[PDB]
Each structure stands twice: as C-alpha cells, then as structure tokens.
Design a protein around this ligand. Sequence first.
Ligand SMILES: *P(=O)(O)OCC(C)(C)[C@@H](O)C(=O)NCCC(=O)NCCS[C@@H](CS(=O)(=O)NC[C@H]1O[C@@H](n2cnc3c(N)ncnc32)[C@H](O)[C@@H]1O)[C@@H](N)CO
Ligand SMILES: [Cl-]
Lengths: 66, 1231
Amino acid sequence: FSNPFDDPQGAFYILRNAQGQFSLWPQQCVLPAGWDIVCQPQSQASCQQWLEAHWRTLTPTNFTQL
Amino acid sequence: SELPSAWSVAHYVELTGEVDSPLLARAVVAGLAQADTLRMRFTVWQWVDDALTFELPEIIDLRTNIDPHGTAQALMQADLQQDLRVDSGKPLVFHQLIQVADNRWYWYQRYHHLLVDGFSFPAITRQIANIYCTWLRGEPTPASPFTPFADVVEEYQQYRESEAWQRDAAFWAEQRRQLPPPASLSPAPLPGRSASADILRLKLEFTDGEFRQLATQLSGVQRTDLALALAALWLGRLCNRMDYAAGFIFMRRLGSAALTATGPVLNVLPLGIHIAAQETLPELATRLAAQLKKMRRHQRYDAEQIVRDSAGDEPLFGPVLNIKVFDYQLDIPDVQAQTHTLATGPVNDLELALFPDVHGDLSIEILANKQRYDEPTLIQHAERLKMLIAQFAADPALLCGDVDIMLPGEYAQLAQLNATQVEIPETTLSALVAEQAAKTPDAPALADARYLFSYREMREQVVALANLLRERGVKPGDSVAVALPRSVFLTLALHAIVEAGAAWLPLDTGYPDDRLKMMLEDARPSLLITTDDQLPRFSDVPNLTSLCYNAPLTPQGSAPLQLSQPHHTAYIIFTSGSTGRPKGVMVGQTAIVNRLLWMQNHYPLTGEDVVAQKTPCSFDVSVWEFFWPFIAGAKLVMAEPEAHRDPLAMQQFFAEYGVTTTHFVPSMLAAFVASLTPQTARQSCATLKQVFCSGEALPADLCREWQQLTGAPLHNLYGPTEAAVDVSWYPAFGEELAQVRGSSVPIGYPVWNTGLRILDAMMHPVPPGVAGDLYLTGIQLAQGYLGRPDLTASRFIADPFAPGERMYRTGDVARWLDNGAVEYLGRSDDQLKIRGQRIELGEIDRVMQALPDVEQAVTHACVINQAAATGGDARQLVGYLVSQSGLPLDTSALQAQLRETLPPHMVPVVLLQLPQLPLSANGKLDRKALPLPELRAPKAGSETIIAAAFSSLLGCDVQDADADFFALGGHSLLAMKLAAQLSRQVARQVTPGQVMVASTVAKLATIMGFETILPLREGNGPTLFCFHPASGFAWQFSVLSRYLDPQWSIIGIQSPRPNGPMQTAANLDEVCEAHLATLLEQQPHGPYYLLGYSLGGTLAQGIAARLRARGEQVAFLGLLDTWPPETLDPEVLAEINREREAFLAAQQGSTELFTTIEGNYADAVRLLTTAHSVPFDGKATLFVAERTSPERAWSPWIAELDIYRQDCAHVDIISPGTFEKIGPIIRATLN
Ligand SMILES: *P(=O)(O)OCC(C)(C)[C@@H](O)C(=O)NCCC(=O)NCCS[C@@H](CS(=O)(=O)NC[C@H]1O[C@@H](n2cnc3c(N)ncnc32)[C@H](O)[C@@H]1O)[C@@H](N)CO
Ligand SMILES: [Cl-]
C-alpha cells in the first residue's frame, strides 16, 4: 500500500555501496548509481533472512574504529 | 423536484458575404417553430406548450459605430450576463443578428441548458440556414428534420423498461463499486457543484511536431486513443495518483436519433483510470481504448441516474476528458460561416478536450474553474504535457511510471532549497563541552533543587565518573544503560558516558520488567547506571553490571579524557517496531554534533539563558536539552520528576529558575495554554525568549493563542529519531505565522547539511503542491538500527540522486509549498503519533494475538468521548478481540497481562470482544464499523466530590465507584484539568500523575522525613548539621543546600512523635545531650559544623560546648536570630506563635496526624523555661534580623561574634528569599 517498500508481495534487490552498507531496492524501479547488486530480487522475508546472516557489523562496538 | 439552474449556452455564427437580413430573421422563426422541444415550459412542473410563439430577431446595424466588433461583443455579453427567468411561458431562446460590416454579420444564439447542448445546437443553426438557402432559390419551406418531443419521450420510456436497462444498471453499479476517488490538479478540495458559469477557456496548439513523430512510430494506435492515453497519464502523474476517477463524454442518443434530436444528447459518465507504472504507452492506449468500448455499450444509461442510486458531499469524478469533435459547418452559397462559442456552461474542476488534426499535430482546449485555477498555472501544466509527449517520441518503449513531468525551473528550485552545505569541525560532544568549560569555568551550568554546579565543578564530576566507568570496564565503543530519576546526576551521567567514548541507552523505569530485560538483551550494555531503589528490578537480568550514582564524587582535575571520536555512536533510542519487538536507533557522534552546532547558530544562546530539562530521557528531544546549553554557556535546570505532566508545576518551575528556553509537544502546549491566565502567563512565562515545538502537527490557531498570551517566539521543528532529533525548521510566530494558510504550521526548511526529497512510488520527484513520500538525506542520518540489518536496509535505502550516499524513508506524506517550505500531510503506514508518543499499531496487535485463546485482534485509535475533545490529541487505544473458541475472554484480566509486556502508553485503555471481526465486501476490515465503547458500590461521601468532577469534564454522569477515568474517554491531557479542579475542591494538592497510577473514583479518593535524622542532601565530604526549631523539623533547611559546595553533606536532626526527645525530656539538657548521641555516632571525631535558628540555635550552642568538653574542634557554629534564654516570658510567645503560623502556612494545608507539629511547640514552651546558656569560648556566626543589642546579649557565651545584617524579621530570616543572601555566606565561611 502506497510506499513501494511496504509491499509484502514485492520483490527486492539487495544493493551494497563502498562503505559496506546494504539497501533494498524494489524490482520495478531503475537501479541507483553507486550501488552494486548483491542479491537478485527476493521476497520480503527472503531478504530478511539473507540480511540477518550477511550484515552483522551493525552494533555500536563496530563503529569504534573506522 | 426543484426548479432548474437558469444558465444558458451562447454562440454566434460569423457570416461573411451578402446576407439577406430580414429573410434570415424570418428563417429563424421558421426554424425554431419546427422544433417543439424549444417550446418547452417550466411552471414544480416541466412540459411543452405549443401555444408559444417566437418573435423575429431584432436586427442591429453597427456599421456606423466607432468600433463595430467591440460593440457587438458588448451586446452579446449584455444579454448573456442577465439571469434567465425559467418562469413564465417566455421561450428560453434568443437570437439577434448584429451587422458589423456590409459583408459581415454576427448571428448571436442563446438557449437554456435544458433545450440544447453543445452537440445539438448546430442542428438548429443548420436547419435555419437550410430554410434560408431554400427560399433564396424560390422554393417552399423545407420539412421538419427533428422528431417531435412526444416521440423522444416515448423513446426513453421504450428504454428503461427494456433488458438494455437493468443490464446497463448492473454495469454502472459495478463501475462505481471499484471506482477510485477523484483527483484534481488543484490543491483545493473538490466541491460537488459549481456556481459560476463564467469560466476560463484556454486553447493551445502544439507546433513542436513531437506528437506527429509519436503517432508515426505507433502506427497501429488510433490517434484519438493515443492522445487520450497521454492525457490519462499526464493527469495521473501531475497528481501523483495512479488510480483516479475522471469523467468522459458519451451520448444518450446515437445514430440518427442524435442527429435528429433538439437536445440535450451528451452524457458525462464516470471513468476509472489505472496507470500501471511498468506499462508502455501502447499498452495503456490499448487497455484504455478497450475499456471505453465496453462502456459505450452501456452509454445510453443516464448520468443523473448513477447519482440517485449512488447534497454537497464529494463528487464522483474530477477531470473530464473529451475526445469528440462537433460539426459546426454550414453551406450558404458564397457565404463563409464560422461559429464562435460564448457560453459553454459551468465546470466543476477541469475539462480537457484533445484534437489530433489531419496533419498529425495536436491541439488541446482547456476549460477550468476560475476559483481553482488561473491563467499561468495552466500554461505551466500544459508545458509538462509538451515534454511528456516529447519523452515518448524519443523512446516509445518508455515506461509510464518512469516518465518525467517536472520542469527545468523546478529542478533548480530544489537545488537551491537543499544547498545546506556548511563546513563543521570534525569534533565530538565532549570536545564541545570542554571548549565552553574553558571559556566560562565560573558561570553556573547545572542545577536542581539541591545542587548548583559551575562549569569547572561540572567537568570535575564528569571526568570523575568517566574514570569510574573506565575502572568498571567501559571501553570506547560500549553502551551504558541509564535508569536514573531526573536530577543533576542524570545530566552528569550522560556527559560521563560520552567522555568515556561510550553511547548511552536511556531507560524508562515505568516500562515493565519484561520489556527492559528485552531491551537490555538486544543492546547488551557494558554497565547499567541506576539507583539503589531501582536495583532489585534488574536482578532477573543476567550478565549485567550495576553502578549506583546518586552522590557527587571526589574531584581530581577537569582535564578531558579525549576518548571520544567522531565515528563513535553517541546514543541509542529505542522505538516501537511493527513486528512486535522494539528497535534501537544508533545515532552517530558527528550526526548529533551537526544538529547542535546548527541549533546554536540559528537560535543563539548566551550565558544569561536558562534551558529547562523536562523531557523524559527516553525521548530523543532531551538530547539537545542535555548538551546544547553546555556548548553555549547557558544554564541547565532540572525539573522535578513527574513534572513534565503537570502544567501548574511547570508554571512554578519556569518562574523559579527564570527559564528562557524550553520545548513543548503541541498537545502539551495546548494543555499548558488551557491552564494559563494572562496574569499567570506574565508570572511564569515572562522570561521565555524562545520555545520549540516538535513531534506532532502544530496547529496554527494554537500558535496565535500562544502569541497573545506571552508573545514569546515559537519554532516548529520536524524530524524522526533516525535523523538525529530534528531535520527541518520553520518559524511559528510573527509574520510567517500570519501568512500560514493551512491548518498546521509547515515543517519548514532543511537544517545544516541536510536534504529533503518528496518522491513518488517510482522514486521520481513531484511538482509543488503535490503529495509524495518524504525522504531525508544528509550528515544527520543515523548509523542504522541496532541488531536489525533487515530493518536498516528497508528504511535506510539508496539515494538515486546522490550516487553511493544513503537516504532515510520517513513514512511521512508531504508536499512542497510555493515558498519552498514542506507541509506535513500524514503517514503512509500504521504508525501513529498520540500526543507526541510514537506508537506502532502493529506491535500492539502482535502482542494481543499471542494472548491465550485469541483468534483475531485489532488496535484502533479513536476519540471515545467528545466532551474530552477540548484541545490537544484526545485519541485513545481501543483493542478489539475475537476468541478462537467462541468463549468470553475476560478482557480485564487480559488487559492486566498486556501491562506486563507493553509500555503504559501502548496498552489499550479498553478491550472489547467481538463475535466476528467487522470486515467489508473487500475483506479489508472496515474501521468505521468498529463499535466505540459505551459510557458498583455507589460513590460515597468523600468520593462524591471527585465523582462529580468526572461528570464535568467527561460530560457523562458517573454514579458508581471503580469508574475508570480513561475508559470513559479521559486522557492524560484531561487529567491535568482534573487534578487542577480537585485541588480547588480539596485543601490538599492533587497532581495529574496521581490520576495516572490510579484512575478510579474510589481508588483516587484513597490517595519530608518524619524520622530522627533528615537526609536533606547526602554528599561525600564534610557534614553540616542543622538543628530543628520549635516545630521539631528541619524541613526549612531545604533551601540552604543549593548555596553550598556540592561535596558538602547536609543532615538535619529533629524530634518526632511519639517517643521523641522533646516529648520525653524533663530538662532541655536531657534533649541537648540526646542529640549528642545521634550527632556523635555519625561523626565520632570532628571537626563539626552546626547551624541552629531559634530553638535549634540554643540547642546547637549547648552541643557546641558539650563537644568542647571533648576532644574535637568546632569549626563552624551558625545561629539564625537566636537569643539566649536569659534574655514565663510574654511577647516571645507571640513570636514563636508567628513561628508556628509561618511553619503551618508552608505545608500547603496538607495534613490529621500532624498534631505532632503543634504538640512539639507545646513541649517547646515548657522546655524554654528551665534553660541555661553554656560558656563556649570559641567563634560563632550570627545572623540578625534588623527589624526586631545582639553583641552584649551574647558577649559572655561566645568570645568571637562575626555578625551579618539582614532586613527581615525573626519569622522571615529562614525564608527562601533571605537565604538568597545568607546562603553564600555559609559557603564562604565553610572553606
Ligand atoms: P498522556 O499519558 O498521552 O501524556 C501526555 C504527554 C504530552 C505528557 C506525553 O504524551 C508526553 O510526555 N509526550 C512527549 C512526547 C515526546 O516528547 N515525543 C518526542 C517527539 S518525536 C521525536 C522523534 S519520533 O520518531 O518519535 N517522532 C517523529 C515523527 O513524528 C512526526 N512529527 C515530528 N515532528 C512533526 C511536525 N513538526 N509536524 C508534524 N509531524 C511531526 C512525524 O510523523 C515523524 O515521523 C522527535 N525527533 C521529534 O522532534
Ligand atoms: Cl498521526
């Protein structure tokens, strides 16, 4: 409804920038510049399962250095 | 039904050539007489009177006028701007014939709108011309081509009784079922009808040749269906609505029946238009053309019929798309005929006709309401269509969702609004606070009711605690949870955590233990800072180190530790998640530094400003309350706990410290203004120099009501937690407030190094005034969600306008205003903002669907009672349950279970069980069918006044106790008016927080240490002992603490009842040596610091000498207007009576068990009659009231007397205003 990211039936790329940050991108939109495609379009819960296993540097003790 | 509108259609045929004028006029009467529909008559009744006649048109000769054309227009306008009668048999037809030249004629024609329409009037003009031409050949008058009015009426009754009807009815019944809501190119609401028949006509020919090239690439596409596909896309894109209802011109009569009819014929019917973003222009042109074909098989159906089976409510459609062309051609021998249109009729919104010519080019005709549109903004929209077409002529494989409808001058205006680049230093919070502390080390910085720190003193305590945190294993990059009451040590703790290079995690102790443990298991902080009282709650939390911080530490220098780095996390604020579990927002160090440096640049603070700390630490608004005053030199003052909920306690708090800067939530500002009178508004809010509102939509009417009371500048700020406090700003006072047209103050312009986007579903920008999805870019974005990469990648998305950068998805719907400011419009998700509290309805539903035997559960926000809708946000959380077994659920016991999981504000106030969840034909849960909750030991005799107070505010008679204040429609804003109303009806004070913990008639009706030792302020270093006066309580020494060095402890000792030193002593030396037991045990060896006042003065001067029998030294002995007992005596009983009068007047008349107070005075009088002053050779300090011989009267009982003068009485020498001068003297003497 309304926002294309709130669509539970939508498919989403998983993108990654130079700083190792991950962004979902809806399949129906033109891909943004500066981001690499990591995963092909998956489900809302499939993206949730991939992100929880490949992006675990998201704690305040991980921003302690760089 | 009702007599119709009386607006007419007007046109003139411009004839060029030799015209037989008195013959053509005679041909008009002959033509009009043939059509018996033009003899229609209204009298309510509507019928045809064939006894009506037509008069010859009056011929007018303007060839000898100074301006033949201009005068001819005025003539036709003078008849057109007159209201037609519709009454009488007066035929509603009028023709003219104005002669402009020898060869040029203006043939004016006017008809009532119920006689002809835009399609049928050329039939009458052509028949009059046929009669005219036929006579010019010498032939008789031609027959009547029109069918009589009787035959067209039976034609309609032939219909409506057939199977085509009911079949057409079933089609347009299902059409309005899936008919989307209408759209409009105007930001104004859409009215049902429209008054003015004077409209705005606009004709535009596109000579760029782009449409010609578009149709030559789409050869198989019909040009009318292609042009219509363009308009359908053009309207949806400009309104940012892919589904909208439009109108379309059909015909109720077809074939010969339409060419023969006198009119009307046209039929405007609803048309649902869906714009699929992934489609190409041919596919949209195909589906749209195939959709009209199905509608044309039912176009004979009446348009006024769709309305009847559907006043001034919203209409069915907005824009009207016309693809038809009307034949105005006449053939008069050697005469050129050109029809010019004067009056088409009223338009409600916008009519758009498209004309692809024979050569392939494209012209459009725009008709618009003059109230909703103007000349230039239509040219601007029609320019967007010119580039719309051009982008498909370049690439016909372009998707309809990716087509660009924004002009080149609006991309530039967005490049100017986001030019917020400001170079800031690569610094941290600790470096900014240490910078200001070096500037003004002696200025006042932090103060509550028992403390006042200078900047140097504050940094000494912060570094002391930050070293203690390091000694307990807090390394840079860790989290520290904080569960502290609002005091100076709450502020110190946060600064100390940042000083150690760690991030702080604020905890609301009002949350249940199951949620705090869940929050602590997700953040996993290295240490928890709390008090000893809150400690037993965290015992069930495994692997968590505790630290009790409730007293100042020993200071060891103020040098900064330099452990903080800009890349570190500054703080973690938890919010509600739509999946059930809360989520933590980690805000970086650089993100909060930019927010504060802008705050100080845009709203400068100085050393005479007083910032208030009243926002609960859980809310990220407090973040700039804890640090912004310390990067500027201002003073930060701690409000009392539970005082942010009390407007009256807020008024006392503002006047007490002279607060200059504070924050408000619009619901609280509305409740604060409701408690204000102009007398109290200048007694508390007089020192306010600037006030900030955020968290909710700020009503402009409230700001004007706030500007009249105080005149203090008000500022609207907007931003989510993920964007470091606030992301935009807008003035809510002065000239900007008077120029606000909307209901709410705009959220404004971007702060430093911050951008705003407002995009559609395909991530393209939207033109001004059009609603879109609000996104945030810049240096102020959060690092992400703690432990939640799935949430981060979903809300912190890629930014297609800044390669590689990131962009936060707010979930807010917003639009651009003409001045560049952003206006908040609403949400796009199920997140609500109740009185400033961020609440996710998804979480509350997930917890209720986990309850025992619960099949379905729905949370809903509504106003239970309309008598409580006075100001602020009156919404309540109402939960609806469906049992899986069909058995009753006992909702009150389920409500108690929810309170052990959800925060108090997220717990529904009422739980109602439903047989079936009220779905609709869609299956999408109709929330308007959700039933609002309806409004036993009868009251009492004491709770009869409070039960009468509910009936006042709640507007409903409450007669039985255990009546929940909230379940009757009350809310925490109305509890402030409730507690303020009971405080006038009871001698005892009632705080709005007492209503919170116990909201019930009988439970609210049931609702300063009394021990030997009074712990006024427990510090670290030396202890100043204050002795009780004749009342037997050291309560009045509360105001001395703030004037002392924070290391000093202050322990007042007193005499309680029963079993008290004044009640049990026969001699005054029996009690004077009884306090030597309590004083010597806590300081077995001195030195000693003693203060007395009146009876406590002689009680200290006896101990000060009983200690000089020891053994230890007496460093400070202070006496507040004390006299030796050698000075029963009268007149001193009138003085100690004034001591009893003043002491009781400061208890607010609360309480009674306090016969102890007057009892102590009675046992004090009999104790003063056997008293005897002891030597004490040392030095003592005297404070004397000038308004009542202190030297010689004390001479042989204290060798040294330093003495100080104060203009007061013996009663007011202990007053808070007198300690304003006495206070600093004790501090200066004690060191
Ligand atoms: P009763 O038992 O209900 O008690 C009543 C009172 C008022 C005492 C109680 O409700 C209370 O203490 N309230 C204080 C609430 C508070 O301080 N809240 C923090 C403000 S919001 C915060 C971030 S947020 O994510 O929580 N909210 C962001 C969210 O809010 C909307 N919003 C913010 N600013 C807006 C403006 N100016 N106009 C319209 N909408 C605004 C947006 O939807 C946004 O997404 C802070 N960052 C806000 O400054
Ligand atoms: Cl809301």
